[PDB]
Amino acid sequence: MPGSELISGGWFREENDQWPGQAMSLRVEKVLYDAPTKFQHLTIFESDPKGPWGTVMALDGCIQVTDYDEFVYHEVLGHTSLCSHPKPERVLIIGGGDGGVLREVLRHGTVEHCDLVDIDGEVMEQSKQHFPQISRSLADPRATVRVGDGLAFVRQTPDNTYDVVIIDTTDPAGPASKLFGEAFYKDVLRILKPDGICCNQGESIWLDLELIEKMSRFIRETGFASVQYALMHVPTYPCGSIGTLVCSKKAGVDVTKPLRPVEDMPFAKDLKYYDSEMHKASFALPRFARHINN
Amino acid sequence: MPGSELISGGWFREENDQWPGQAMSLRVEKVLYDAPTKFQHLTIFESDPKGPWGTVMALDGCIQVTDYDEFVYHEVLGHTSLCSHPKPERVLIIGGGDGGVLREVLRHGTVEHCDLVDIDGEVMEQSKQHFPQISRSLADPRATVRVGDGLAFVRQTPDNTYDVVIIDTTDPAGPASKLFGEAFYKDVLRILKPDGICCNQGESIWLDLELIEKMSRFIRETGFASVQYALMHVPTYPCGSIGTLVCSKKAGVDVTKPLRPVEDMPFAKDLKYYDSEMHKASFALPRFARHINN
Ligand SMILES: C[S@@H](CCCN)C[C@H]1O[C@@H](n2cnc3c(N)ncnc32)[C@H](O)[C@@H]1O
Ligand SMILES: C[S@@H](CCCN)C[C@H]1O[C@@H](n2cnc3c(N)ncnc32)[C@H](O)[C@@H]1O
Ligand SMILES: C[C@H]1CC[C@H](N)CC1
Ligand SMILES: C[C@H]1CC[C@H](N)CC1
C-alpha cells in the first residue's frame, strides 16, 4: 500500500505492484494535502505549471483525477450508460466521491434523482476544496451523497430500485476489492429495474485483460443479458487508457449504438470527449482484446 | 538534449522539454547499448522482467519501441495507408530504420518494391541485434534500405515515383526537424503518383494539437486533396497514444473507410491490433480534437 513516499525529489511517481516495472511520473509544484483517511492514503498536489495537468489526486498511490483529462472518463461513464437506457430516471453511483460522473449524469433531463455512495467521506471533502469544477455536482438538488461501503449499500437496497447503476471505483487492491466480485454483480442485477443498465471501472486491456475476461464472463452468467467493453483514452491512468463494461439486464439491447443519442439533448456541444461517434468507436477493440466483445 | 543521465536509481525516466512536467518511467534490468550515434543518442535496455515491456529503445531520450506494444504503431501506419490505396506497388518509407513498418508493408501481395531511408545506420544495426522480430524485414529482397536524410532523398526523387510514402520519424527536436515542414510535404506530394497516399508520425492530440492543426492545414495547402488524423493506443508513447495524418493526393478518396479491407487478404489473422473495425474507429476523435478531421 503506497503512501507519501511516492513524492520524492520534486516528482510524483506512480509505482505500484499492480503494474510492476513502470510508473507514470508527474513533477510536483506544491503538495496541497497528503494524509491517511479512515480508508486510504489520499494525496493532492499541484503539478508543474509548465505542463497541462493542473491539480492531481491519488488514492493509495493511484492517480484518480487530473484537471486536464478528467472529462474523458466522467463523460464516457455518464453518457455511454445513460444514452443506452430508454428513460433513466433514478441512478445510483457507487464510489465517484469526486463528483465527476455525477456532474455528467445530472446533465440528463430525464434524471429525477441520483444517489451516490462512496466509502471515503474525505474524497468528497477534498474534492470540494481542490476540484471545484468536478465536485460542484455534489451540491445538486437532485443528488443524495452518502458515505458508506457500496457492497453494504446495494445489499440493503430493494429489488427493482434503479434504472442505471454506475460503479466508479478505485483499483481492486484496497477497499474496492469486493466490488470486482461476482456476488456484488449479482446484487447489482437484483437492484436494477427490468430495463436496467450497469457500467463500471473496467480496468486496462494492456495490464488486466485476464480480469476483464473473468468479469465479462461472470456478469453474463450472473444474469445480465449483454456485456460490452468500451475503451477510452485517459493519459493519466496506467498505459494511457481504461474501459468500462456496459451491461444490460434486458435482452435484445445493443449498447454499442446510442439508444438516445446525446446530439438530441441541449448539452451535447458542452462535452469535451463523448458524442455518438465516440460511443460507437469505443466498442471497437484491438484484435488481441476483441474476444471480450465477440 | 537528453542522454545517459535519463537512467538513474535503476529506472529510465523519459523526461523531455517536448512534454514538460511528465515522464513515463521504466525499471531497467540490463543496459544493452547507450552511446551517441553520428546523429542522436541511442539507448537500448532490457526492462523489468516482472513487467511485460521486454527490450526498450530510446533516441535522444524518447522511447521509440518496446517488445510489448510495437505492433500497434507499425500495423496502423503500414495497413491504414496501404488498405486506402487501390493497388500499392511501390512504397517509400522515410525513417523506420527499426524495420517495423517495413515488416507490415511487406505482408501486402501487391507491393513489388519498398525503399526505406533512415538517417541513422546505427539504429538499423542495433535493431537487427536487439529487435530481430521488428527488423527481420530489412533483409527482404523486396526492400532497398538506404542510410541518408529523408529530406534530401525526396528532393532527389523524380515526380510520380511512389504509390505510398510513409513518414515514420522521431519527434521534431533532432534530425527529423524539417520533416515536419511544409517544404518537405510539397516534395512528398510531387513524388507521389496521381493516386498516391502518404501518412506520417503525426504526434499527440494531448500535447501537440496545435502542431497537428498547422500540419493538417499546410498539407491541404500544398495540394493534398484530403488529410485525416487516425488516433491509436500506444502505452509507451507520451500520454499513451499517437496519431498519423493519412493524406490523399487524388480528390474523392475516403481514407477513413478501408478501400481494400484487410479481411480479404491472407495475413489479416496474423495482426494483433489492426482490422477494418479498428481502422474506421481510429478516425473518430474526441470532441476537443475533432475539428482536425471535420
Ligand atoms: C475517486 S473515484 C475514481 C476517480 C474518477 N472518478 C474512486 C472511488 O471509489 C471509492 N471506493 C472504493 N471502495 C469503495 C467501496 N467499497 N464503496 C464505495 N466506494 C468505494 C473510493 O473511495 C474512491 O473515491
Ligand atoms: C525508430 S523509427 C520510430 C520508431 C517506430 N518505428 C524513427 C526514425 O526516424 C529516423 N529519422 C530521423 N530523422 C530522419 C531524417 N532526417 N531522415 C530519415 N530518417 C530520419 C531516426 O533515425 C529513427 O530511426
Ligand atoms: C478510476 C480508476 C482510477 C485508478 C486507475 N488505476 C484506474 C481507474
Ligand atoms: C514514432 C515516434 C517515436 C517518439 C514518440 N514521442 C512519438 C512516436
XYZ file of C-alpha atoms and ligand atoms in Angstrom:
652
model
C 0.000 0.000 0.000
C 1.828 3.124 -1.299
C 1.602 6.497 0.532
C 3.662 9.704 0.980
C 6.931 8.182 -0.190
C 5.796 8.305 -3.860
C 6.652 12.035 -3.825
C 10.360 12.425 -3.941
C 12.851 14.814 -5.467
C 10.145 17.037 -6.930
C 8.167 14.305 -8.760
C 5.245 12.047 -8.013
C 5.941 8.539 -9.273
C 3.071 6.121 -9.629
C 4.979 2.941 -8.650
C 2.597 0.081 -7.803
C 2.822 -3.739 -7.767
C -0.472 -3.765 -9.712
C 1.684 -2.624 -12.701
C 5.190 -3.851 -11.953
C 8.143 -2.239 -13.673
C 6.523 1.000 -14.939
C 5.347 4.236 -13.368
C 3.828 7.363 -14.726
C 5.658 10.405 -13.162
C 4.417 13.965 -12.795
C 6.554 16.808 -11.463
C 5.160 18.290 -8.225
C 4.900 22.043 -7.898
C 3.243 22.062 -4.432
C 1.637 19.306 -2.263
C -1.823 20.604 -1.227
C -2.866 17.697 1.075
C -1.406 14.369 1.971
C -2.889 12.132 4.716
C -4.266 8.768 5.659
C -8.060 8.882 5.566
C -10.090 6.294 7.528
C -9.687 4.001 4.493
C -6.965 5.021 2.024
C -3.922 7.202 1.601
C -5.061 10.489 -0.122
C -2.566 12.843 -1.839
C -3.420 16.070 -3.747
C -0.751 18.160 -5.459
C -0.432 20.907 -7.943
C 1.640 19.615 -10.880
C 4.177 21.684 -12.859
C 2.557 24.874 -14.202
C 4.708 24.403 -17.320
C 2.686 21.268 -18.110
C -1.084 20.973 -18.697
C -2.098 18.572 -15.859
C -3.131 21.140 -13.193
C -4.211 19.615 -9.800
C -3.781 15.846 -9.358
C -5.409 13.448 -6.909
C -4.076 9.969 -5.938
C -5.653 7.259 -3.656
C -3.274 4.543 -2.279
C -0.710 5.892 -4.740
C -3.009 5.552 -7.820
C -3.781 8.628 -9.894
C -7.597 9.298 -9.656
C -8.154 12.596 -11.416
C -6.286 15.468 -13.007
C -7.721 18.848 -14.032
C -6.684 18.331 -17.629
C -8.122 14.953 -18.659
C -10.870 14.185 -16.033
C -13.601 14.965 -18.589
C -12.932 11.737 -20.569
C -13.719 9.054 -18.027
C -16.538 11.074 -16.442
C -18.284 11.697 -19.754
C -17.768 8.181 -21.056
C -19.218 6.525 -17.939
C -22.030 9.087 -17.535
C -23.283 9.287 -21.089
C -22.476 5.822 -22.505
C -24.674 4.255 -19.729
C -27.480 6.893 -19.746
C -27.642 7.095 -23.577
C -28.122 3.300 -23.544
C -31.240 3.481 -21.342
C -34.767 4.292 -22.610
C -35.627 6.753 -19.771
C -33.129 6.878 -16.957
C -34.942 8.486 -14.012
C -33.162 7.062 -10.913
C -29.445 6.484 -10.912
C -27.016 5.079 -8.406
C -23.299 5.870 -8.355
C -21.082 3.617 -6.224
C -17.740 5.332 -5.476
C -17.390 8.537 -7.567
C -16.818 10.677 -4.435
C -15.029 13.331 -6.536
C -18.440 14.149 -8.172
C -17.249 13.730 -11.823
C -19.673 11.010 -13.093
C -22.488 12.716 -11.056
C -21.835 16.020 -12.909
C -22.314 14.188 -16.220
C -25.394 12.133 -15.058
C -27.182 15.393 -13.991
C -26.871 16.965 -17.437
C -29.619 14.470 -18.400
C -33.171 15.937 -18.212
C -34.725 12.544 -17.574
C -32.864 12.037 -14.318
C -35.099 12.720 -11.299
C -32.652 11.562 -8.696
C -29.102 10.272 -8.311
C -27.813 8.532 -5.165
C -24.018 8.489 -4.769
C -22.358 6.277 -2.145
C -18.562 6.420 -1.529
C -16.882 4.657 1.379
C -14.465 7.534 1.873
C -16.017 10.938 3.018
C -12.619 12.608 2.799
C -12.583 12.136 -1.034
C -15.850 14.222 -1.177
C -14.405 16.871 1.192
C -11.063 17.248 -0.613
C -12.735 17.163 -3.951
C -14.916 20.114 -2.792
C -11.808 22.038 -1.676
C -9.431 21.326 -4.600
C -11.509 20.276 -7.645
C -14.481 22.652 -7.600
C -15.204 22.020 -11.290
C -15.509 18.224 -10.633
C -17.332 18.328 -7.303
C -19.849 21.128 -7.752
C -22.366 18.276 -8.718
C -22.324 17.087 -5.115
C -24.440 20.054 -4.087
C -27.181 19.418 -6.770
C -30.824 19.366 -5.622
C -31.219 16.006 -7.499
C -28.334 14.298 -5.682
C -28.059 12.411 -2.358
C -24.416 11.986 -1.231
C -23.786 9.210 1.320
C -20.635 7.938 2.987
C -20.734 4.135 3.192
C -19.480 0.831 1.746
C -21.037 0.216 -1.694
C -21.363 -3.566 -1.158
C -23.451 -2.997 2.046
C -25.446 -0.277 0.250
C -26.580 -2.462 -2.645
C -27.279 -5.362 -0.274
C -29.567 -3.017 1.746
C -31.417 -1.790 -1.371
C -34.814 -3.261 -2.589
C -35.205 -5.208 -5.846
C -36.000 -3.017 -8.844
C -34.909 0.326 -7.424
C -32.604 1.792 -10.112
C -32.580 2.371 -13.858
C -28.789 2.821 -14.037
C -26.015 1.737 -11.656
C -22.524 3.175 -12.242
C -19.618 1.567 -10.371
C -16.822 4.240 -10.317
C -14.265 2.645 -8.084
C -10.551 2.536 -7.329
C -8.467 -0.479 -8.402
C -9.131 -3.920 -6.801
C -6.370 -3.554 -4.134
C -7.860 -1.620 -1.224
C -11.445 -1.089 -0.157
C -12.878 -1.625 -3.738
C -11.718 -5.302 -3.572
C -15.193 -6.997 -3.289
C -16.723 -4.581 -5.873
C -14.899 -6.616 -8.558
C -16.556 -9.849 -7.397
C -19.343 -11.993 -8.712
C -21.511 -11.717 -5.560
C -21.627 -7.929 -5.865
C -22.695 -8.041 -9.529
C -25.468 -10.441 -8.660
C -26.797 -7.853 -6.174
C -26.366 -5.111 -8.751
C -28.505 -7.144 -11.125
C -31.176 -7.564 -8.445
C -31.482 -3.772 -7.638
C -31.822 -2.820 -11.280
C -35.265 -2.465 -12.788
C -36.070 -4.629 -15.863
C -34.541 -2.216 -18.428
C -31.526 -1.668 -16.123
C -28.066 -0.621 -17.349
C -24.870 -1.021 -15.307
C -21.339 0.145 -16.150
C -18.143 0.030 -14.179
C -14.469 0.986 -13.858
C -13.427 -1.948 -16.055
C -9.590 -1.734 -15.963
C -6.949 -1.971 -18.702
C -6.633 -4.217 -21.788
C -2.831 -3.943 -21.502
C -2.461 -4.914 -17.854
C -5.769 -6.566 -16.707
C -7.052 -8.327 -19.825
C -7.464 -11.630 -17.843
C -9.527 -9.870 -15.159
C -11.635 -8.280 -17.892
C -12.214 -11.700 -19.482
C -13.239 -13.072 -15.998
C -15.616 -10.230 -15.213
C -17.400 -10.229 -18.569
C -17.893 -13.993 -18.272
C -19.305 -13.962 -14.747
C -21.501 -10.874 -15.271
C -23.186 -12.535 -18.282
C -23.531 -15.733 -16.186
C -24.973 -13.981 -13.159
C -27.832 -12.976 -15.416
C -27.031 -9.819 -17.369
C -28.244 -10.223 -20.920
C -25.283 -8.426 -22.592
C -21.878 -7.062 -21.577
C -19.678 -4.948 -23.917
C -16.343 -3.297 -23.014
C -15.919 0.370 -24.096
C -12.261 1.567 -24.435
C -11.334 5.266 -23.800
C -8.156 7.404 -23.885
C -7.042 8.684 -20.497
C -3.316 9.714 -20.444
C -3.118 9.624 -16.623
C -4.407 6.113 -15.985
C -1.823 3.319 -16.338
C -0.859 2.714 -20.007
C -2.977 5.642 -21.256
C -6.433 4.017 -21.280
C -9.220 2.447 -19.171
C -12.535 0.901 -20.075
C -15.965 0.287 -18.809
C -18.087 -2.857 -19.007
C -21.524 -1.696 -20.190
C -24.117 -4.265 -19.111
C -27.851 -4.583 -19.933
C -30.339 -6.522 -17.706
C -32.829 -6.699 -20.648
C -32.155 -8.956 -23.616
C -32.005 -7.698 -27.193
C -30.427 -4.337 -26.287
C -27.453 -3.161 -28.356
C -25.408 -0.878 -26.002
C -22.776 -0.227 -28.722
C -25.064 2.115 -30.660
C -26.708 5.053 -28.673
C -30.402 4.370 -27.928
C -30.865 8.028 -27.019
C -28.107 9.962 -28.904
C -26.631 12.844 -26.886
C -26.825 15.015 -30.085
C -30.590 15.341 -29.391
C -30.040 16.889 -25.950
C -29.264 20.542 -25.310
C -25.870 19.907 -23.596
C -24.108 17.832 -26.363
C -21.953 20.681 -27.591
C -20.713 21.258 -23.974
C -18.982 17.879 -23.900
C -15.233 17.688 -24.468
C -14.806 13.972 -25.297
C -18.037 11.956 -25.855
C -20.509 12.079 -28.780
C -22.297 9.227 -30.685
C -19.302 8.636 -32.992
C -17.038 8.214 -29.974
C -19.685 5.935 -28.267
C -19.641 3.552 -31.290
C -15.874 3.691 -31.760
C -15.157 2.953 -28.090
C -16.537 -0.642 -28.596
C -14.065 -1.461 -31.361
C -11.164 -3.187 -29.701
C -7.598 -4.050 -30.857
C -7.560 -7.602 -32.332
C -5.754 -9.006 -29.300
C -8.630 -7.896 -26.956
C -11.621 -8.221 -29.340
C -12.748 -11.634 -27.845
C -14.061 -9.621 -24.810
C -16.786 -8.122 -27.079
C -17.168 -11.066 -29.520
C 19.213 17.499 -25.399
C 18.986 14.192 -23.304
C 21.441 11.293 -22.933
C 22.698 8.647 -20.467
C 21.550 10.685 -17.460
C 17.962 9.502 -18.034
C 18.911 6.204 -16.317
C 19.189 6.746 -12.573
C 18.379 4.633 -9.492
C 17.537 1.508 -11.573
C 14.972 3.381 -13.764
C 14.718 5.087 -17.153
C 12.751 8.356 -16.952
C 11.507 9.814 -20.222
C 11.909 13.479 -19.196
C 11.872 15.898 -22.125
C 11.049 19.547 -22.724
C 8.709 18.424 -25.556
C 6.372 17.210 -22.756
C 7.292 19.360 -19.781
C 6.227 18.142 -16.284
C 5.678 14.487 -17.092
C 7.650 11.314 -17.826
C 6.916 7.628 -18.332
C 9.331 5.642 -16.183
C 10.517 2.034 -16.749
C 12.703 -0.062 -14.377
C 15.985 -1.060 -16.094
C 17.148 -4.623 -15.805
C 20.247 -4.501 -18.077
C 21.548 -1.694 -20.246
C 22.320 -3.149 -23.708
C 23.570 -0.068 -25.608
C 23.969 3.534 -24.656
C 26.058 5.963 -26.714
C 25.875 8.725 -29.216
C 25.437 7.743 -32.840
C 26.523 10.158 -35.647
C 23.110 11.812 -35.243
C 21.425 11.063 -31.976
C 21.715 9.484 -28.537
C 20.755 5.808 -28.679
C 19.729 3.870 -25.503
C 18.605 0.216 -25.607
C 17.696 -1.691 -22.395
C 16.102 -4.778 -21.059
C 13.232 -3.625 -18.846
C 11.949 -5.319 -15.661
C 11.146 -8.982 -16.378
C 8.399 -8.696 -13.766
C 6.674 -6.244 -16.174
C 5.542 -7.001 -19.780
C 7.664 -4.415 -21.775
C 10.758 -6.578 -22.715
C 13.524 -4.678 -24.604
C 13.157 -0.864 -24.995
C 14.783 1.574 -27.461
C 15.051 5.336 -26.947
C 16.532 8.010 -29.303
C 17.535 11.395 -27.808
C 15.764 10.120 -24.675
C 12.383 9.390 -26.390
C 11.033 5.843 -26.325
C 10.820 4.531 -29.962
C 9.872 0.896 -29.496
C 9.239 -1.809 -26.847
C 8.714 -5.524 -27.475
C 5.222 -5.492 -25.937
C 3.340 -2.803 -27.841
C 5.425 -2.108 -31.030
C 2.832 -3.949 -33.192
C 0.247 -1.122 -32.754
C 2.014 1.763 -34.485
C 3.630 -0.454 -37.134
C 0.269 -2.083 -38.080
C -1.632 1.178 -38.057
C 0.884 3.065 -40.320
C 1.529 0.125 -42.679
C -2.086 -1.070 -43.138
C -4.189 2.112 -42.764
C -2.211 3.640 -45.680
C -1.933 0.522 -47.941
C -5.552 -0.523 -47.417
C -6.515 3.034 -48.528
C -4.645 2.636 -51.865
C -6.244 0.814 -54.888
C -3.009 -1.089 -55.705
C 0.126 -0.082 -53.731
C 3.097 -1.446 -55.695
C 5.968 0.898 -54.865
C 6.340 2.260 -51.386
C 8.769 4.637 -49.755
C 9.397 4.605 -46.018
C 11.123 7.666 -44.544
C 12.670 6.895 -41.106
C 11.573 3.473 -39.963
C 15.158 2.136 -39.513
C 13.864 -0.432 -36.920
C 12.086 -2.271 -39.840
C 8.635 -2.372 -38.183
C 6.520 -0.519 -40.711
C 8.508 -2.282 -43.435
C 7.542 -5.706 -41.884
C 3.862 -4.690 -42.193
C 4.134 -3.209 -45.678
C 5.716 -6.424 -46.997
C 2.743 -8.502 -45.868
C 0.854 -6.948 -48.814
C 0.986 -9.062 -52.033
C 0.574 -6.011 -54.230
C 3.933 -4.491 -53.091
C 6.696 -5.091 -55.683
C 9.341 -2.849 -54.089
C 9.834 -0.726 -50.924
C 12.628 1.850 -50.440
C 13.408 2.680 -46.825
C 15.552 5.649 -45.987
C 16.691 6.453 -42.415
C 19.415 8.921 -41.402
C 20.848 6.647 -38.678
C 22.677 3.439 -39.732
C 23.311 2.621 -36.082
C 19.539 2.376 -35.432
C 19.301 -0.228 -38.193
C 22.342 -2.102 -36.836
C 21.025 -2.165 -33.206
C 17.574 -3.088 -34.368
C 18.970 -6.138 -36.111
C 20.848 -7.075 -32.911
C 18.194 -6.369 -30.219
C 14.831 -6.413 -32.073
C 15.031 -9.331 -34.583
C 11.178 -9.634 -34.711
C 10.899 -5.988 -35.800
C 13.951 -5.832 -38.028
C 13.649 -9.194 -39.934
C 12.121 -7.181 -42.858
C 15.300 -5.169 -43.532
C 16.951 -8.136 -45.346
C 13.905 -8.718 -47.615
C 14.737 -8.844 -51.338
C 11.723 -6.591 -51.985
C 13.315 -3.735 -49.878
C 16.165 -1.396 -50.733
C 17.494 0.055 -47.443
C 19.359 3.426 -47.564
C 21.242 5.379 -44.829
C 20.509 9.018 -45.598
C 18.477 12.116 -44.827
C 14.798 11.716 -45.915
C 14.576 15.405 -46.935
C 17.406 15.159 -49.474
C 16.196 11.723 -50.623
C 12.704 13.019 -51.532
C 14.163 16.177 -53.077
C 16.239 13.934 -55.363
C 13.367 11.617 -56.348
C 11.598 12.054 -59.742
C 7.956 13.149 -59.926
C 5.328 10.375 -59.767
C 7.605 7.624 -58.393
C 5.684 6.136 -55.400
C 2.228 4.758 -54.614
C 2.589 5.319 -50.918
C 5.012 7.322 -48.772
C 5.151 6.613 -45.089
C 6.964 9.069 -42.864
C 7.943 7.190 -39.664
C 10.053 9.757 -37.828
C 11.296 10.683 -34.402
C 9.825 13.832 -32.711
C 10.595 17.267 -34.216
C 13.600 18.001 -31.901
C 16.649 16.448 -33.599
C 17.353 15.277 -37.156
C 13.567 14.887 -38.096
C 13.123 18.614 -37.674
C 12.494 19.648 -41.317
C 10.361 16.542 -41.954
C 7.579 18.338 -40.075
C 7.864 21.266 -42.514
C 5.682 22.431 -45.396
C 8.666 22.323 -47.920
C 9.092 18.608 -47.264
C 5.336 17.884 -47.757
C 5.434 19.782 -51.067
C 8.101 17.378 -52.265
C 6.247 14.359 -50.878
C 3.209 15.408 -52.895
C 5.375 15.772 -56.051
C 6.929 12.305 -55.763
C 3.551 10.572 -55.251
C 1.756 9.205 -58.345
C -1.638 10.701 -59.113
C -3.482 8.208 -56.790
C -0.831 8.404 -54.114
C -1.336 8.165 -50.336
C 1.031 9.497 -47.654
C 0.831 9.030 -43.847
C 3.170 10.218 -41.124
C 4.115 10.122 -37.474
C 1.581 12.740 -36.531
C 2.123 13.316 -32.822
C -0.313 13.650 -29.894
C -3.755 15.260 -29.525
C -2.981 15.905 -25.815
C 0.428 17.553 -26.261
C 0.726 18.683 -29.900
C -2.811 19.543 -31.049
C -1.735 22.989 -32.457
C 1.076 21.284 -34.417
C -1.499 18.753 -35.771
C -3.799 21.688 -36.747
C -0.944 23.503 -38.534
C 0.272 20.388 -40.392
C -3.211 19.392 -41.401
C -3.749 22.953 -42.899
C -0.403 23.189 -44.711
C -0.624 19.672 -46.180
C -4.021 20.586 -47.689
C -2.473 23.929 -48.796
C 0.470 22.221 -50.644
C -2.150 20.402 -52.745
C -3.178 17.143 -50.974
C -6.895 16.823 -51.682
C -7.588 15.409 -48.203
C -5.963 14.796 -44.825
C -7.467 12.821 -41.924
C -5.938 12.035 -38.471
C -6.171 8.431 -37.181
C -5.708 8.001 -33.436
C -4.177 4.782 -31.890
C -3.363 3.341 -28.409
C 0.388 3.013 -27.673
C 1.119 2.796 -23.899
C 4.793 3.721 -24.212
C 4.421 6.887 -26.303
C 3.712 10.097 -24.346
C 0.155 10.294 -22.953
C -0.342 6.692 -24.235
C -1.363 7.496 -27.841
C -0.064 8.782 -31.095
C -1.645 9.540 -34.483
C -0.990 9.515 -38.165
C -2.156 12.049 -40.784
C -3.454 9.974 -43.688
C -3.275 12.097 -46.868
C -4.712 11.542 -50.341
C -3.222 13.281 -53.425
C -6.349 12.408 -55.507
C -9.752 14.007 -54.683
C -12.674 11.694 -53.977
C -10.857 9.317 -51.638
C -12.283 8.476 -48.221
C -9.266 7.136 -46.287
C -11.370 6.684 -43.163
C -13.298 3.650 -44.624
C -10.910 0.837 -45.954
C -10.831 0.665 -49.770
C -9.230 -2.811 -49.736
C -10.338 -4.419 -46.477
C -7.568 -6.386 -44.743
C -10.080 -9.153 -44.012
C -9.974 -10.201 -47.636
C -6.190 -10.656 -47.563
C -4.426 -13.835 -46.355
C -2.476 -12.204 -43.453
C -5.398 -10.441 -41.621
C -5.491 -13.074 -38.849
C -1.799 -12.558 -38.125
C -2.330 -8.970 -36.955
C -2.504 -8.129 -33.280
C -4.159 -4.632 -33.318
C -5.434 -3.539 -36.743
C -8.570 -4.629 -38.594
C -11.299 -2.756 -40.543
C -13.317 -2.052 -37.422
C -10.195 -0.530 -35.758
C -9.411 1.428 -38.984
C -12.830 3.080 -39.023
C -12.756 3.677 -35.234
C -9.269 5.308 -35.403
C -10.761 8.360 -37.242
C -13.375 9.121 -34.577
C -11.751 11.855 -32.488
C -12.683 13.133 -29.029
C -14.780 16.354 -29.403
C -11.968 18.670 -28.318
C -9.798 17.380 -31.236
C -12.433 16.641 -33.847
C -12.032 19.939 -35.782
C -8.804 18.295 -37.152
C -10.894 15.908 -39.246
C -14.043 17.946 -39.770
C -12.199 8.945 -6.866
S -13.304 7.749 -7.715
C -12.334 7.498 -9.281
C -11.787 8.755 -9.890
C -12.554 9.087 -11.131
N -13.936 9.397 -10.703
C -12.909 6.130 -6.910
C -13.662 5.983 -5.589
O -14.039 4.606 -5.284
C -14.301 4.651 -3.866
N -14.473 3.310 -3.259
C -13.516 2.330 -3.100
N -14.024 1.280 -2.457
C -15.358 1.593 -2.224
C -16.407 0.904 -1.628
N -16.221 -0.397 -1.077
N -17.621 1.504 -1.562
C -17.778 2.733 -2.061
N -16.820 3.454 -2.638
C -15.644 2.843 -2.703
C -13.063 5.393 -3.352
O -13.250 5.928 -2.061
C -12.829 6.464 -4.395
O -13.352 7.751 -4.018
C 12.806 4.323 -34.693
S 11.742 4.991 -36.018
C 10.316 5.233 -34.881
C 10.086 4.004 -34.020
C 8.798 3.451 -34.538
N 9.161 2.771 -35.829
C 12.227 6.777 -36.173
C 13.407 7.018 -37.117
O 13.382 8.400 -37.656
C 14.718 8.471 -38.195
N 14.995 9.804 -38.735
C 15.066 10.980 -38.027
N 15.390 11.984 -38.827
C 15.498 11.449 -40.093
C 15.776 12.006 -41.336
N 16.002 13.376 -41.470
N 15.758 11.225 -42.434
C 15.488 9.930 -42.246
N 15.216 9.265 -41.109
C 15.235 10.091 -40.058
C 15.511 8.150 -36.935
O 16.866 7.810 -37.213
C 14.725 6.945 -36.385
O 15.370 5.723 -36.725
C -10.881 5.382 -11.847
C -9.786 4.371 -11.627
C -8.638 5.150 -11.014
C -7.492 4.192 -10.740
C -6.900 3.809 -12.066
N -5.701 2.932 -11.788
C -7.983 3.082 -12.804
C -9.262 3.921 -12.995
C 7.472 7.027 -33.511
C 7.666 8.261 -32.612
C 8.710 7.991 -31.543
C 8.753 9.080 -30.453
C 7.375 9.406 -29.817
N 7.437 10.659 -28.970
C 6.367 9.675 -30.916
C 6.311 8.470 -31.910
